[PDB]
Amino acid sequence: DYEIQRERIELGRCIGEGQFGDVHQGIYMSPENPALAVAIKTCKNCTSDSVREKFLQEALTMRQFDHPHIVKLIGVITENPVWIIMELCTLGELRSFLQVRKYSLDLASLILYAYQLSTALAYLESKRFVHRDIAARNVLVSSNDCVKLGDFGLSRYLPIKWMAPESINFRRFTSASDVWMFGVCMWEILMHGVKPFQGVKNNDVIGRIENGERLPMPPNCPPTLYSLMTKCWAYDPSRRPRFTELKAQLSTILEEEK
Amino acid sequence: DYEIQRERIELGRCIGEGQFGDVHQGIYMSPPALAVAIKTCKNCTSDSVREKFLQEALTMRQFDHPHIVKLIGVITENPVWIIMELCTLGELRSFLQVRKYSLDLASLILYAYQLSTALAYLESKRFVHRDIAARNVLVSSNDCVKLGDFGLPIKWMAPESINFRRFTSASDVWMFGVCMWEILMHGVKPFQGVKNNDVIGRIENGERLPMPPNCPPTLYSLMTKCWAYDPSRRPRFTELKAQLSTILEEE
Ligand SMILES: Brc1cncc(-c2nn[nH]n2)c1
Numbered sequence: 001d002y003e004i005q006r007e008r009i010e011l012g013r014c015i016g017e018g019q020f021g022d023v024h025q026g027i028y029m030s031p032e033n034p035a036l037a038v039a040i041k042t043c044k045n046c047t048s049d050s051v052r053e054k055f056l057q058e059a060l061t062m063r064q065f066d067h068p069h070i071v072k073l074i075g076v077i078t079e080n081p082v083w084i085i086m087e088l089c090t091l092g093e094l095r096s097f098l099q100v101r102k103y104s105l106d107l108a109s110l111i112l113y114a115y116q117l118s119t120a121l122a123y124l125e126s127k128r129f130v131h132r133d134i135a136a137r138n139v140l141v142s143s144n145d146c147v148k149l150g151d152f153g154l155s156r157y158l159p160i161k162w163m164a165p166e167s168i169n170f171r172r173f174t175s176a177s178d179v180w181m182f183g184v185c186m187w188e189i190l191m192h193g194v195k196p197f198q199g200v201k202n203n204d205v206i207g208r209i210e211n212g213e214r215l216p217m218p219p220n221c222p223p224t225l226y227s228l229m230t231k232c233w234a235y236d237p238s239r240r241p242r243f244t245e246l247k248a249q250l251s252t253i254l255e256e257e258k
Numbered sequence: 259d260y261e262i263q264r265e266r267i268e269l270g271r272c273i274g275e276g277q278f279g280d281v282h283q284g285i286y287m288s289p290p291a292l293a294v295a296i297k298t299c300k301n302c303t304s305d306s307v308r309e310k311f312l313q314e315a316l317t318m319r320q321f322d323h324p325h326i327v328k329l330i331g332v333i334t335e336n337p338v339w340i341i342m343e344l345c346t347l348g349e350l351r352s353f354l355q356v357r358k359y360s361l362d363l364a365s366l367i368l369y370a371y372q373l374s375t376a377l378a379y380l381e382s383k384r385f386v387h388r389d390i391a392a393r394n395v396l397v398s399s400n401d402c403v404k405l406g407d408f409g410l411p412i413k414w415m416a417p418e419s420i421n422f423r424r425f426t427s428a429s430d431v432w433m434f435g436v437c438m439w440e441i442l443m444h445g446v447k448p449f450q451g452v453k454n455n456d457v458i459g460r461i462e463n464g465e466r467l468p469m470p471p472n473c474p475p476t477l478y479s480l481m482t483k484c485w486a487y488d489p490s491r492r493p494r495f496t497e498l499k500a501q502l503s504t505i506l507e508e509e
Protein backbone atom coordinates (compact mmCIF):
# COMPACT_ATOMS: atom_id res chain seq x y z
CA ASP A 1 0.00 0.00 0.00
CA TYR A 2 2.75 2.48 1.11
CA GLU A 3 5.54 0.55 -0.70
CA ILE A 4 6.42 2.30 -4.04
CA GLN A 5 8.32 0.83 -7.05
CA ARG A 6 11.66 2.69 -7.46
CA GLU A 7 11.34 2.64 -11.31
CA ARG A 8 8.21 4.89 -11.04
CA ILE A 9 10.41 7.56 -9.33
CA GLU A 10 12.76 9.74 -11.36
CA LEU A 11 15.20 11.61 -9.05
CA GLY A 12 15.83 15.31 -9.73
CA ARG A 13 17.74 18.23 -8.18
CA CYS A 14 18.62 18.53 -4.46
CA ILE A 15 16.09 21.01 -2.93
CA GLY A 16 17.25 20.85 0.70
CA GLU A 17 19.16 19.14 3.48
CA GLY A 18 17.50 16.91 6.05
CA GLN A 19 18.31 15.13 9.32
CA PHE A 20 19.28 11.73 7.71
CA GLY A 21 20.36 12.87 4.24
CA ASP A 22 19.54 15.09 1.26
CA VAL A 23 16.03 16.07 0.19
CA HIS A 24 15.50 15.96 -3.61
CA GLN A 25 12.67 16.95 -5.95
CA GLY A 26 11.40 14.34 -8.41
CA ILE A 27 8.70 12.78 -10.56
CA TYR A 28 6.34 9.89 -9.68
CA MET A 29 4.83 8.20 -12.78
CA SER A 30 1.73 6.39 -11.37
CA PRO A 31 -1.24 4.92 -13.43
CA GLU A 32 -3.31 8.09 -12.61
CA ASN A 33 -1.02 11.18 -13.12
CA PRO A 34 1.56 11.10 -16.00
CA ALA A 35 4.18 12.98 -13.88
CA LEU A 36 3.43 14.03 -10.25
CA ALA A 37 6.05 16.38 -8.73
CA VAL A 38 7.37 14.85 -5.49
CA ALA A 39 9.96 15.41 -2.73
CA ILE A 40 12.30 12.46 -1.95
CA LYS A 41 13.78 12.37 1.57
CA THR A 42 16.99 10.27 1.41
CA CYS A 43 18.95 8.45 4.13
CA LYS A 44 22.80 8.39 4.03
CA ASN A 45 23.60 5.67 6.61
CA CYS A 46 20.46 3.55 6.32
CA THR A 47 22.33 0.20 5.96
CA SER A 48 22.12 0.26 9.81
CA ASP A 49 18.65 -0.93 10.85
CA SER A 50 18.67 1.37 13.97
CA VAL A 51 18.99 4.52 11.74
CA ARG A 52 16.46 2.96 9.27
CA GLU A 53 13.86 2.42 12.09
CA LYS A 54 14.35 6.06 13.26
CA PHE A 55 14.05 7.45 9.67
CA LEU A 56 10.97 5.34 8.73
CA GLN A 57 9.27 6.43 12.00
CA GLU A 58 8.32 9.78 10.30
CA ALA A 59 6.39 7.82 7.58
CA LEU A 60 4.65 5.76 10.33
CA THR A 61 3.40 9.00 11.97
CA MET A 62 2.65 10.70 8.60
CA ARG A 63 0.21 8.04 7.25
CA GLN A 64 -2.27 8.75 10.18
CA PHE A 65 -2.99 12.33 8.96
CA ASP A 66 -4.97 13.63 5.97
CA HIS A 67 -5.37 17.39 5.87
CA PRO A 68 -5.05 20.10 3.14
CA HIS A 69 -2.42 22.03 5.19
CA ILE A 70 -0.26 19.05 6.28
CA VAL A 71 2.42 17.51 3.97
CA LYS A 72 1.02 14.29 2.41
CA LEU A 73 3.04 11.03 2.43
CA ILE A 74 2.88 9.45 -1.05
CA GLY A 75 4.94 6.37 -0.22
CA VAL A 76 8.13 4.68 0.93
CA ILE A 77 10.95 2.61 -0.63
CA THR A 78 12.33 0.32 2.10
CA GLU A 79 14.94 -1.44 -0.12
CA ASN A 80 18.44 0.21 0.06
CA PRO A 81 18.83 3.17 -0.68
CA VAL A 82 15.81 3.94 1.59
CA TRP A 83 13.54 6.81 0.39
CA ILE A 84 10.43 8.61 1.76
CA ILE A 85 8.18 10.05 -1.01
CA MET A 86 6.20 13.18 -0.04
CA GLU A 87 4.12 15.79 -1.88
CA LEU A 88 6.30 18.65 -3.16
CA CYS A 89 5.96 22.24 -1.89
CA THR A 90 7.74 24.02 -4.78
CA LEU A 91 8.33 27.42 -3.07
CA GLY A 92 10.24 25.76 -0.15
CA GLU A 93 10.77 26.84 3.51
CA LEU A 94 8.47 29.59 4.94
CA ARG A 95 11.29 31.54 6.74
CA SER A 96 13.21 31.92 3.49
CA PHE A 97 10.08 32.76 1.39
CA LEU A 98 9.07 35.55 3.85
CA GLN A 99 12.60 37.04 3.94
CA VAL A 100 12.76 37.18 0.11
CA ARG A 101 9.18 38.57 -0.23
CA LYS A 102 9.42 41.10 2.70
CA TYR A 103 8.53 44.12 0.53
CA SER A 104 5.89 42.37 -1.65
CA LEU A 105 3.65 40.37 0.73
CA ASP A 106 0.59 42.17 2.17
CA LEU A 107 -0.77 41.74 5.75
CA ALA A 108 -3.81 39.77 4.37
CA SER A 109 -1.42 37.05 3.03
CA LEU A 110 0.47 36.99 6.37
CA ILE A 111 -2.79 36.53 8.37
CA LEU A 112 -3.85 33.85 5.76
CA TYR A 113 -0.70 31.73 6.53
CA ALA A 114 -1.41 31.86 10.28
CA TYR A 115 -5.09 30.90 9.60
CA GLN A 116 -4.02 27.93 7.42
CA LEU A 117 -1.55 26.81 10.07
CA SER A 118 -4.22 27.09 12.80
CA THR A 119 -6.51 24.76 10.73
CA ALA A 120 -3.79 22.04 10.48
CA LEU A 121 -3.04 22.39 14.24
CA ALA A 122 -6.76 22.20 15.08
CA TYR A 123 -6.95 18.91 13.03
CA LEU A 124 -3.93 17.55 15.01
CA GLU A 125 -5.63 18.65 18.30
CA SER A 126 -8.76 16.70 17.15
CA LYS A 127 -6.55 13.53 16.70
CA ARG A 128 -5.12 14.26 20.23
CA PHE A 129 -1.65 14.61 18.62
CA VAL A 130 1.13 16.88 19.99
CA HIS A 131 3.56 18.28 17.34
CA ARG A 132 6.37 19.40 19.75
CA ASP A 133 7.99 21.70 17.07
CA ILE A 134 5.88 24.53 15.63
CA ALA A 135 8.20 27.08 13.91
CA ALA A 136 8.38 28.98 10.57
CA ARG A 137 11.34 26.67 9.63
CA ASN A 138 9.02 23.56 9.77
CA VAL A 139 6.43 25.26 7.47
CA LEU A 140 6.57 24.70 3.66
CA VAL A 141 5.11 26.93 0.91
CA SER A 142 3.07 25.10 -1.76
CA SER A 143 1.80 28.29 -3.55
CA ASN A 144 1.42 32.09 -2.87
CA ASP A 145 -1.85 31.28 -1.01
CA CYS A 146 -1.15 27.77 0.43
CA VAL A 147 1.19 26.63 3.24
CA LYS A 148 1.74 23.19 4.74
CA LEU A 149 3.04 21.82 8.07
CA GLY A 150 5.97 19.40 7.65
CA ASP A 151 8.73 17.90 9.88
CA PHE A 152 7.09 15.05 11.86
CA GLY A 153 10.38 13.38 12.97
CA LEU A 154 11.56 16.13 15.43
CA SER A 155 14.90 17.18 13.80
CA ARG A 156 15.91 19.47 16.74
CA TYR A 157 15.09 16.77 19.43
CA LEU A 158 17.04 22.46 21.09
CA PRO A 159 14.49 25.26 20.11
CA ILE A 160 14.49 27.08 23.51
CA LYS A 161 13.27 30.38 21.98
CA TRP A 162 10.07 28.68 20.64
CA MET A 163 9.35 26.42 23.67
CA ALA A 164 6.78 27.11 26.44
CA PRO A 165 8.33 27.57 29.99
CA GLU A 166 7.16 24.10 31.22
CA SER A 167 8.88 22.40 28.21
CA ILE A 168 12.20 24.19 29.02
CA ASN A 169 11.94 23.57 32.82
CA PHE A 170 10.32 20.09 32.91
CA ARG A 171 10.14 18.79 29.28
CA ARG A 172 6.31 18.74 29.45
CA PHE A 173 4.75 18.75 25.94
CA THR A 174 1.00 19.17 25.68
CA SER A 175 -1.68 20.83 23.49
CA ALA A 176 -1.05 24.05 25.56
CA SER A 177 2.70 24.08 24.79
CA ASP A 178 1.84 23.71 21.06
CA VAL A 179 -0.34 26.88 21.42
CA TRP A 180 2.67 28.83 22.88
CA MET A 181 4.82 27.65 19.89
CA PHE A 182 2.11 28.71 17.38
CA GLY A 183 2.18 32.17 19.07
CA VAL A 184 5.96 32.47 18.41
CA CYS A 185 5.34 31.23 14.85
CA MET A 186 2.70 33.98 14.22
CA TRP A 187 5.31 36.51 15.49
CA GLU A 188 7.94 35.12 12.98
CA ILE A 189 5.37 35.42 10.10
CA LEU A 190 4.69 39.13 10.87
CA MET A 191 8.43 39.71 11.49
CA HIS A 192 9.06 38.50 7.87
CA GLY A 193 11.09 35.39 8.84
CA VAL A 194 13.17 36.94 11.66
CA LYS A 195 14.23 34.50 14.46
CA PRO A 196 12.89 35.22 18.00
CA PHE A 197 15.26 36.61 20.71
CA GLN A 198 18.26 37.54 18.56
CA GLY A 199 21.53 38.04 20.45
CA VAL A 200 20.05 36.43 23.57
CA LYS A 201 21.62 33.30 25.05
CA ASN A 202 19.38 30.18 25.35
CA ASN A 203 20.08 29.91 29.13
CA ASP A 204 18.96 33.59 29.60
CA VAL A 205 15.61 33.05 27.72
CA ILE A 206 13.79 31.15 30.54
CA GLY A 207 14.88 33.85 33.05
CA ARG A 208 13.24 36.52 30.86
CA ILE A 209 9.97 34.53 30.32
CA GLU A 210 9.68 33.90 34.11
CA ASN A 211 10.10 37.71 34.68
CA GLY A 212 7.05 38.30 32.46
CA GLU A 213 9.08 39.46 29.42
CA ARG A 214 7.60 38.69 25.96
CA LEU A 215 8.34 39.25 22.22
CA PRO A 216 7.52 42.85 21.15
CA MET A 217 4.57 43.81 18.93
CA PRO A 218 5.86 43.63 15.29
CA PRO A 219 5.85 47.03 13.43
CA ASN A 220 3.25 45.80 10.87
CA CYS A 221 0.73 44.26 13.30
CA PRO A 222 -2.96 44.75 14.12
CA PRO A 223 -3.06 45.24 17.96
CA THR A 224 -5.98 42.72 17.95
CA LEU A 225 -3.64 40.06 16.44
CA TYR A 226 -0.90 40.85 19.01
CA SER A 227 -3.65 40.59 21.70
CA LEU A 228 -4.18 37.00 20.43
CA MET A 229 -0.42 36.06 20.64
CA THR A 230 -0.24 37.37 24.26
CA LYS A 231 -3.06 34.89 25.10
CA CYS A 232 -0.84 32.04 23.67
CA TRP A 233 2.00 33.30 25.92
CA ALA A 234 0.19 32.95 29.29
CA TYR A 235 2.66 31.43 31.81
CA ASP A 236 -0.06 29.02 33.14
CA PRO A 237 -0.86 26.42 30.40
CA SER A 238 -4.52 26.05 31.57
CA ARG A 239 -5.04 29.80 30.74
CA ARG A 240 -3.92 29.43 27.02
CA PRO A 241 -6.62 29.19 24.28
CA ARG A 242 -7.26 26.05 22.19
CA PHE A 243 -6.72 25.85 18.35
CA THR A 244 -10.53 25.79 17.65
CA GLU A 245 -10.74 29.33 19.26
CA LEU A 246 -7.53 30.62 17.51
CA LYS A 247 -8.93 29.40 14.13
CA ALA A 248 -12.18 31.37 14.75
CA GLN A 249 -10.34 34.51 15.98
CA LEU A 250 -7.98 34.57 12.92
CA SER A 251 -11.11 34.31 10.68
CA THR A 252 -12.54 37.57 12.12
CA ILE A 253 -9.04 39.24 12.04
CA LEU A 254 -8.64 38.20 8.32
CA GLU A 255 -11.94 39.97 7.49
CA GLU A 256 -11.97 43.05 9.84
CA GLU A 257 -8.36 44.22 9.23
CA LYS A 258 -7.96 43.90 5.40
CA ASP B 259 -17.41 40.69 42.97
CA TYR B 260 -20.71 38.83 43.62
CA GLU B 261 -21.42 39.81 47.30
CA ILE B 262 -25.21 40.24 47.72
CA GLN B 263 -27.05 41.95 50.62
CA ARG B 264 -29.34 39.35 52.32
CA GLU B 265 -32.31 41.81 52.42
CA ARG B 266 -32.28 41.50 48.59
CA ILE B 267 -33.01 37.70 48.94
CA GLU B 268 -36.46 36.22 49.91
CA LEU B 269 -36.26 32.46 50.75
CA GLY B 270 -38.97 30.10 49.43
CA ARG B 271 -39.71 26.34 49.36
CA CYS B 272 -37.03 23.58 49.48
CA ILE B 273 -36.58 22.30 45.88
CA GLY B 274 -33.75 19.80 46.48
CA GLU B 275 -30.94 18.44 48.61
CA GLY B 276 -27.30 19.30 48.07
CA GLN B 277 -23.82 18.31 49.29
CA PHE B 278 -23.58 20.96 52.10
CA GLY B 279 -27.25 21.59 52.84
CA ASP B 280 -30.70 22.17 51.34
CA VAL B 281 -31.36 23.86 48.01
CA HIS B 282 -34.28 26.33 48.09
CA GLN B 283 -36.09 28.39 45.47
CA GLY B 284 -36.37 32.14 46.03
CA ILE B 285 -36.65 35.73 44.81
CA TYR B 286 -33.84 38.25 44.17
CA MET B 287 -34.91 41.93 43.90
CA SER B 288 -32.47 44.20 41.98
CA PRO B 289 -32.74 47.62 40.15
CA PRO B 290 -36.83 43.44 38.59
CA ALA B 291 -37.71 40.42 40.87
CA LEU B 292 -36.00 37.20 39.64
CA ALA B 293 -36.62 33.51 40.50
CA VAL B 294 -33.44 32.04 41.98
CA ALA B 295 -32.04 28.88 43.59
CA ILE B 296 -30.35 29.29 47.03
CA LYS B 297 -27.76 26.66 47.95
CA THR B 298 -27.48 26.58 51.76
CA CYS B 299 -24.73 25.30 54.04
CA LYS B 300 -25.64 23.45 57.27
CA ASN B 301 -22.29 23.46 59.13
CA CYS B 302 -20.66 26.55 57.60
CA THR B 303 -19.69 28.11 61.00
CA SER B 304 -16.52 25.99 60.41
CA ASP B 305 -14.22 27.94 58.05
CA SER B 306 -12.88 24.66 56.49
CA VAL B 307 -16.44 23.66 55.30
CA ARG B 308 -17.07 27.34 54.31
CA GLU B 309 -13.89 27.43 52.10
CA LYS B 310 -14.93 24.11 50.44
CA PHE B 311 -18.55 25.33 49.85
CA LEU B 312 -17.53 28.81 48.52
CA GLN B 313 -15.03 27.13 46.14
CA GLU B 314 -18.04 26.15 43.90
CA ALA B 315 -18.90 29.86 43.49
CA LEU B 316 -15.21 30.69 42.72
CA THR B 317 -15.27 28.02 39.90
CA MET B 318 -18.61 29.25 38.50
CA ARG B 319 -17.80 32.97 38.16
CA GLN B 320 -15.42 31.97 35.29
CA PHE B 321 -18.14 30.57 32.98
CA ASP B 322 -20.80 32.20 30.80
CA HIS B 323 -22.67 29.73 28.60
CA PRO B 324 -26.39 29.15 27.74
CA HIS B 325 -26.23 25.50 28.95
CA ILE B 326 -24.28 26.07 32.20
CA VAL B 327 -25.95 27.21 35.48
CA LYS B 328 -25.24 30.94 36.07
CA LEU B 329 -23.96 32.23 39.45
CA ILE B 330 -25.96 35.31 40.48
CA GLY B 331 -24.13 35.96 43.76
CA VAL B 332 -22.99 34.93 47.25
CA ILE B 333 -23.74 35.82 50.90
CA THR B 334 -20.60 35.12 52.96
CA GLU B 335 -22.03 36.25 56.35
CA ASN B 336 -23.55 33.36 58.43
CA PRO B 337 -25.79 31.61 57.29
CA VAL B 338 -23.70 31.29 54.07
CA TRP B 339 -25.73 31.17 50.79
CA ILE B 340 -24.88 30.72 47.07
CA ILE B 341 -27.42 32.38 44.69
CA MET B 342 -27.83 30.65 41.30
CA GLU B 343 -30.15 30.71 38.27
CA LEU B 344 -33.36 28.64 38.87
CA CYS B 345 -34.02 25.47 36.74
CA THR B 346 -37.68 24.88 37.68
CA LEU B 347 -38.04 21.25 36.37
CA GLY B 348 -35.11 20.04 38.57
CA GLU B 349 -32.69 17.07 38.16
CA LEU B 350 -32.40 15.38 34.70
CA ARG B 351 -32.26 11.74 35.96
CA SER B 352 -35.64 12.28 37.83
CA PHE B 353 -37.27 14.21 34.90
CA LEU B 354 -36.38 11.35 32.45
CA GLN B 355 -37.73 8.58 34.78
CA VAL B 356 -41.04 10.44 35.25
CA ARG B 357 -41.49 11.13 31.48
CA LYS B 358 -40.42 7.57 30.29
CA TYR B 359 -43.63 7.51 28.13
CA SER B 360 -43.80 11.32 27.44
CA LEU B 361 -40.45 12.13 25.64
CA ASP B 362 -39.58 11.50 21.97
CA LEU B 363 -36.09 10.51 20.65
CA ALA B 364 -35.64 14.04 19.15
CA SER B 365 -35.84 15.57 22.69
CA LEU B 366 -33.39 12.92 24.03
CA ILE B 367 -30.82 13.68 21.26
CA LEU B 368 -31.41 17.44 21.90
CA TYR B 369 -30.33 17.08 25.60
CA ALA B 370 -27.11 15.27 24.58
CA TYR B 371 -26.44 18.02 21.96
CA GLN B 372 -26.99 20.81 24.52
CA LEU B 373 -24.80 18.95 27.02
CA SER B 374 -22.02 18.57 24.36
CA THR B 375 -22.08 22.36 23.70
CA ALA B 376 -21.51 23.19 27.42
CA LEU B 377 -18.71 20.56 27.62
CA ALA B 378 -17.10 21.93 24.44
CA TYR B 379 -17.12 25.45 26.06
CA LEU B 380 -15.45 23.98 29.21
CA GLU B 381 -12.87 22.18 26.98
CA SER B 382 -12.15 25.60 25.34
CA LYS B 383 -11.46 27.11 28.85
CA ARG B 384 -9.20 24.02 29.53
CA PHE B 385 -11.52 22.91 32.38
CA VAL B 386 -11.88 19.27 33.49
CA HIS B 387 -15.32 18.66 35.11
CA ARG B 388 -14.41 15.21 36.61
CA ASP B 389 -18.16 14.32 37.15
CA ILE B 390 -20.32 14.01 33.98
CA ALA B 391 -23.56 12.11 34.85
CA ALA B 392 -27.30 12.79 34.21
CA ARG B 393 -27.69 13.49 38.02
CA ASN B 394 -25.54 16.71 37.71
CA VAL B 395 -27.71 18.05 34.82
CA LEU B 396 -30.66 20.44 35.56
CA VAL B 397 -33.81 20.97 33.44
CA SER B 398 -34.76 24.62 32.79
CA SER B 399 -37.62 23.84 30.29
CA ASN B 400 -38.84 20.91 28.07
CA ASP B 401 -36.23 21.95 25.46
CA CYS B 402 -33.41 23.43 27.64
CA VAL B 403 -30.95 21.70 29.98
CA LYS B 404 -28.21 23.24 32.20
CA LEU B 405 -24.90 21.84 33.55
CA GLY B 406 -24.59 22.01 37.36
CA ASP B 407 -22.38 20.70 40.27
CA PHE B 408 -19.02 22.53 40.16
CA GLY B 409 -17.53 21.33 43.46
CA LEU B 410 -17.09 7.55 43.99
CA PRO B 411 -18.77 7.24 40.49
CA ILE B 412 -16.82 4.12 39.36
CA LYS B 413 -19.50 3.14 36.73
CA TRP B 414 -19.13 6.56 34.96
CA MET B 415 -15.29 6.81 35.18
CA ALA B 416 -12.79 6.02 32.37
CA PRO B 417 -10.37 3.06 33.13
CA GLU B 418 -7.35 5.39 33.76
CA SER B 419 -9.37 7.38 36.39
CA ILE B 420 -10.25 4.12 38.26
CA ASN B 421 -6.67 2.66 37.95
CA PHE B 422 -4.56 5.85 38.34
CA ARG B 423 -6.85 8.79 39.44
CA ARG B 424 -5.98 10.40 36.02
CA PHE B 425 -8.55 13.08 34.98
CA THR B 426 -8.20 14.72 31.56
CA SER B 427 -10.33 15.97 28.65
CA ALA B 428 -10.34 12.33 27.33
CA SER B 429 -11.78 10.95 30.60
CA ASP B 430 -14.54 13.62 30.42
CA VAL B 431 -15.39 12.26 26.91
CA TRP B 432 -15.80 8.70 28.35
CA MET B 433 -18.14 10.13 31.07
CA PHE B 434 -20.20 12.01 28.44
CA GLY B 435 -20.59 8.67 26.60
CA VAL B 436 -22.05 7.03 29.74
CA CYS B 437 -24.27 10.11 30.21
CA MET B 438 -25.69 9.78 26.64
CA TRP B 439 -26.44 6.11 27.44
CA GLU B 440 -28.36 7.12 30.66
CA ILE B 441 -30.40 9.75 28.66
CA LEU B 442 -31.53 7.10 26.10
CA MET B 443 -32.05 4.56 28.93
CA HIS B 444 -34.56 7.09 30.51
CA GLY B 445 -32.42 7.69 33.61
CA VAL B 446 -31.44 4.06 34.36
CA LYS B 447 -28.07 3.68 36.19
CA PRO B 448 -25.18 2.01 34.28
CA PHE B 449 -24.02 -1.53 35.35
CA GLN B 450 -26.87 -2.52 37.67
CA GLY B 451 -26.11 -5.41 40.00
CA VAL B 452 -22.34 -5.15 39.19
CA LYS B 453 -20.02 -4.39 42.18
CA ASN B 454 -17.76 -1.29 41.73
CA ASN B 455 -14.58 -3.43 42.10
CA ASP B 456 -15.84 -5.81 39.32
CA VAL B 457 -16.49 -2.90 36.84
CA ILE B 458 -12.80 -2.26 35.92
CA GLY B 459 -12.31 -6.02 35.29
CA ARG B 460 -15.18 -5.94 32.76
CA ILE B 461 -13.96 -2.73 30.98
CA GLU B 462 -10.41 -4.22 30.67
CA ASN B 463 -11.97 -7.39 29.08
CA GLY B 464 -13.52 -5.16 26.36
CA GLU B 465 -17.06 -5.27 27.84
CA ARG B 466 -19.27 -2.18 27.23
CA LEU B 467 -22.83 -0.89 27.93
CA PRO B 468 -25.40 -2.40 25.48
CA MET B 469 -27.14 -0.43 22.71
CA PRO B 470 -30.34 1.05 24.29
CA PRO B 471 -33.68 -0.14 22.71
CA ASN B 472 -34.83 2.03 19.72
CA CYS B 473 -31.53 4.05 19.74
CA PRO B 474 -30.07 5.11 16.33
CA PRO B 475 -27.11 2.76 15.56
CA THR B 476 -25.23 5.91 14.38
CA LEU B 477 -25.61 7.44 17.89
CA TYR B 478 -24.43 4.18 19.56
CA SER B 479 -21.49 4.22 17.07
CA LEU B 480 -20.60 7.64 18.58
CA MET B 481 -20.72 6.38 22.24
CA THR B 482 -18.41 3.43 21.37
CA LYS B 483 -15.86 6.03 20.13
CA CYS B 484 -16.03 7.72 23.63
CA TRP B 485 -15.39 4.27 25.18
CA ALA B 486 -12.04 3.54 23.48
CA TYR B 487 -9.66 2.06 26.12
CA ASP B 488 -6.76 4.28 24.88
CA PRO B 489 -7.55 7.96 25.79
CA SER B 490 -5.62 9.31 22.72
CA ARG B 491 -8.13 7.42 20.45
CA ARG B 492 -11.25 9.16 21.99
CA PRO B 493 -12.86 12.10 20.07
CA ARG B 494 -12.89 15.72 21.34
CA PHE B 495 -16.10 17.64 22.27
CA THR B 496 -15.91 19.88 19.16
CA GLU B 497 -16.28 16.67 16.99
CA LEU B 498 -19.02 15.07 19.17
CA LYS B 499 -21.08 18.34 19.09
CA ALA B 500 -20.80 18.45 15.23
CA GLN B 501 -21.81 14.73 15.02
CA LEU B 502 -24.76 15.08 17.51
CA SER B 503 -26.01 18.11 15.50
CA THR B 504 -26.32 15.97 12.29
CA ILE B 505 -27.95 13.01 14.15
CA LEU B 506 -30.49 15.50 15.67
CA GLU B 507 -31.47 17.00 12.29
CA GLU B 508 -31.86 13.44 10.80
CA GLU B 509 -34.48 12.92 13.61
BR1 LIG C 1 8.89 17.22 2.54
C1 LIG C 1 9.17 18.67 1.36
C2 LIG C 1 8.25 18.94 0.35
N1 LIG C 1 8.45 19.95 -0.49
C3 LIG C 1 9.49 20.76 -0.38
C4 LIG C 1 10.46 20.57 0.62
C5 LIG C 1 11.63 21.48 0.74
N2 LIG C 1 12.04 22.36 -0.15
N3 LIG C 1 13.08 22.97 0.27
N4 LIG C 1 13.40 22.56 1.45
N5 LIG C 1 12.47 21.57 1.80
C6 LIG C 1 10.29 19.49 1.51
Ligand SMILES: Brc1cncc(-c2nn[nH]n2)c1
Nearest residue numbers: 273274295342343344345348
Ligand atom coordinates in the same frame (compact mmCIF):
# COMPACT_ATOMS: atom_id res chain seq x y z
BR1 LIG D 1 -28.35 25.22 41.33
C1 LIG D 1 -30.13 24.68 40.98
C2 LIG D 1 -30.92 25.39 40.09
N1 LIG D 1 -32.16 25.01 39.83
C3 LIG D 1 -32.69 23.93 40.39
C4 LIG D 1 -31.96 23.15 41.30
C5 LIG D 1 -32.55 21.92 41.89
N2 LIG D 1 -33.82 21.56 41.89
N3 LIG D 1 -33.98 20.43 42.48
N4 LIG D 1 -32.85 19.99 42.90
N5 LIG D 1 -31.87 20.93 42.53
C6 LIG D 1 -30.64 23.53 41.59
